[PDB]
């Protein structure tokens, strides 16, 4: 199945935070309506914080991409809702062979405020 694709409410601010757990440099892109709106880049094996940003969801069509020097990683994802209100969308990825799926991570959360 496609992974890293999420439908958010339209015209809503969301946070996105990215991490590396990898020797290779991760490129984590956040697409809103098929257009890259944020890019996080880096490496490190101890949950390196690559950045955190707030974006508008546009029509609601979000897609997360993870790659290493142009090669797409294998993604895994899901979305969880707590208290019928607090949403998280998580993405892990695997750039290699050890299948730890932590190499490049994105965590989205909404609503804000």
């Amino acid at each position: 199945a496609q992974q890293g694709v999420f439908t958010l409410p339209a015209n809503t601010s969301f946070g996105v935070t990215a991490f590396a757990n990898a020797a290779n440099t991760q490129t984590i892109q956040v697409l809103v309506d098929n257009v890259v709106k944020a890019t996080f880049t880096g490496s490190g094996t101890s949950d390196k914080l690559l950045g955190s940003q707030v974006l508008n969801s546009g029509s609601g069509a979000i897609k997360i991409q993870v790659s290493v020097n142009g090669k797409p990683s294998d993604l895994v994802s899901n979305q969880t809702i707590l208290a019928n209100k607090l949403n998280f969308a998580m993405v892990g990825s695997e750039d290699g062979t050890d299948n730890d799926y932590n190499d490049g991570i994105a965590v989205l959360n909404w609503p804000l405020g």
Copy 2:
């Protein structure tokens, strides 16, 4: 039910990242074996990043506390596992009456490496 309590594998590094979406100052504490090992503090209504740290899980007994000037918030939490390997533990909290449950957030992830 108790919320914000998680059993991790013992002696394992994990990341914890904290956010505010609140006018009031949040105090988010990460306890390992009943001892506070990290504290994140701040306010802001746009997914303010309060910090991110890597901790050892000790025996595995983690507890997240959220309070505002000493008053415990109402917590909500769960844990998700992706690809049978990548773990997230999420905590939201409500400090007031609007029930957005985003006031003080913690996201834990493991394994690292």
Copy 3:
């Protein structure tokens, strides 16, 4: 936080399946727009299947109640979305003191078809 409350898409069929893991008789009610539309009753400690039904979501306001002889149980719940399409809403409950939270369970899933 309130638990067992879920917002579904309006006018959508969903499945709901109920289980017991309890010595006491569980009463598991599925409310749509504040009106009970299904009730599952029984006991048994080996994941007793109490029933499975398909309901219309009405406006989308679903609430699950669990009680034992009129006494409300303590609920825990969340919602997960897989492949940006397949939804599950889960409810556990505790009727006693052992905090296994499995006494009366409901699992909702949608969309059907």
Copy 4:
């Protein structure tokens, strides 16, 4: 990523319940330590309940397979833990082109009792 693979605690009873939302006949197999221990078969587009069984987890290595007349479906899965105690493992699958991922579903839950 591989999907439908879960690590359970060893020597633990778990419930597994299977559904169809499909015109084609689904074959849903539950493997414990690489050996099929339950098989659910059927079709129907309204959350047809194919069965529910309790199994021992063996070493803990569970795998869910879904196929239609021998052809493996595309699986999606995850695991959620509520109240640090109640576990669900969910599997959806797609046998065709509409990407509803509901064609053959398995829901696992533990602990029982």
